[PDB]
Design a protein around this ligand. Sequence first.
Ligand code: FE2
Length: 836
Amino acid sequence: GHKIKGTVVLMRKNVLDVNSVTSVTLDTLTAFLGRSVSLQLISATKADANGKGKLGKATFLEGIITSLPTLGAGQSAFKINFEWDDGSGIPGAFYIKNFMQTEFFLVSLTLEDIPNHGSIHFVCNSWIYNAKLFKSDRIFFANQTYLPSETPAPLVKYREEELHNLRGDGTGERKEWERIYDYDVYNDLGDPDKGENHARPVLGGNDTFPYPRRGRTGRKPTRKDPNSESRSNDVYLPRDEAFGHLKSSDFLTYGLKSVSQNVLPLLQSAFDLNFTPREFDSFDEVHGLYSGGIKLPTDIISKISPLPVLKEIFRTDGEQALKFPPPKVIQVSKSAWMTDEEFAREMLAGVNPNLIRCLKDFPPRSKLDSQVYGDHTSQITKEHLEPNLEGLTVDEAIQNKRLFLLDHHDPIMPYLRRINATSTKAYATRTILFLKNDGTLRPLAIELSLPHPQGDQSGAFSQVFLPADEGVESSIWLLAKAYVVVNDSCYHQLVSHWLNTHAVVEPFIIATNRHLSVVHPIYKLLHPHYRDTMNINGLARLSLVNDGGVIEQTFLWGRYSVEMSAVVYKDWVFTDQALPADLIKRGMAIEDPSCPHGIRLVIEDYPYTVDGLEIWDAIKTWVHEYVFLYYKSDDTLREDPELQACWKELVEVGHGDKKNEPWWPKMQTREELVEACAIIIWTASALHAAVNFGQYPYGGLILNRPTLSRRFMPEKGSAEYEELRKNPQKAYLKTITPKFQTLIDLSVIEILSRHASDEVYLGERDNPNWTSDTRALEAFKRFGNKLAQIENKLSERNNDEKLRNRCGPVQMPYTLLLPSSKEGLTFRGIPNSISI
Ligand SMILES: [Fe+2]
């Protein structure tokens, strides 16, 4: 015989829930001690009748273990001594039953053994509901990573049964307690039944609007059309994908849900009433927003204070003033944002640093069909480029790759005639920039295009504006740049941030969980990079991207916003997301072996990329060491049933609209798996951090990143032109985002740029001890240590005076891609996952 000693570490529901956490021995713990929680061991050695493990007698939990050197916060440990003997062999898993009717978060189980066998660890981290809601029993497996042979033969059937239980068929309305994973189409976002005007086109499953699938939540469809699904306030996402917190303001999801639920209506009211004016009359009135805040009544102020998590997001006077924090962009100079040098610098080191291209043939073309400006070009004034700096000719400078383009002409042009039928007067833009002889970039022309003055075949109504610094000229130029910037803010929310990151990544979470058992080595590589992404994504469909959401209301594309993001999905090709691939695709880097990342950069002074290539290569070296420690040969891989099922399923199903694309890796080689895995970790950690954490630092001055255009360019000698002349600022303010959306936008982007105190960053942070594989842990440490070396290289780079696109006119050292951050609206820190 032998009693194996176990110590079960756990967390009680109230330690983790928002509704209790509203506050951040005492033997609650006694309740666990009746015939309340029972565990039961499973062998990885002795096999019953038809192989299936062998279950050592259900044991209940006795005695509270008061301390342990390792207990941590909100965790309770319990002791449980299992009866066991030589003849049952080694425990490799365990069943668990909660009878308490209050779920608890199981953290771990350690067994201190009986043969020459060290302490077996189980890293559970999962919610255990009441044993009656389940029809089977929650099984948990030990610490050992096994390739999909499903290795210890007693375990093989237990390994395939859970896999089967997490897929759980595509039927029914998913409940709070469920862990079923499956795909569905974006048919979730509109509400047809509150009017036809409230319908939104189903995204995915068709060619006009292809889209990545999202998690199936199983609700009853809409009444006025069965193809869409009923709205609801609680969107299901598989339990344990929804992450608890020990303190609030860490419930940053709660910040967003209540900003839309409660804050946006009560605030709305002051603009539908009168205590606030509706337009800002001066740049001064905007800068006063984080000086004294917005004088509002206590009917909004006491109502919008104690609502949890939205503390410090709103700095308050105490009463009648909701302040905002100064965004980093004006902390050294309140006026440097207007600088050409800055507008051009944010294309490389800004919130959206990701899009610029080396112009190869002038004039840039559209890539729009037979409606003949696609089969035609940019009307840009070749004979109006280079205002003082270098006087080369066009091809001399294209030979030198000194000209670059921000082309925002094509995604919005189909929808422009419609966006301009409403209240917003958008302007399809492109802008040619010349790399100043000293490393900086300089905007030489913006081309403001409209559709179809008389028609729509040969429909491009282009007007190019050129830089100037005195009089109406500079005021017109400023509004011109304002029209680029507003286009780049919808492109950044809907495509660079939500599409290229949150939407694209959710099929992988669903496919991984449905097919790669927890034990699998690849699953443990990938798992930490999925933390809360299905949860924040559940809330985006509930509030951010739905029928009357903040994005529809706050961004240029308006109601056509996510549909336009699905048209651009037409072009998303998985492999060009890989950073050096992306830099080449855009003609920002040429291949060159000699140069330290296998490619040479045009605009070498370029921060996002110089820094990010460092983090890419670090991820790629980690994943290659990890992959190659389990796969012996390419045949090992090709034979892996769990990896193969997985890849098959997200190509054909999760990214089902794209199933037939020729660029997809067939997972037949290692190095193809290094590449797929390296791209998903990049997207889930450094791309989303790069694209998301500079949002308030830059976009907190609505002046510097406006989201909405209300007027077309001031005409000739007309009273709008005369208003410019006699009051440029009031003219500016009434072209860009009105004040009620400026206030909604700074609330939502303030939250989106916040690091929760319990953020697990890329910087080596896993979160307990996930594997037995010493080789892996060691390799993990090398990753973590290379990242610390990277952070120092990157900060050293911010002090090189010869690198000025790192800082620019309002000395804002590019810190977005430094791995660690402490906790706030810190402009750095790469999380492991898309979490906000
Ligand atoms: Fe995000």
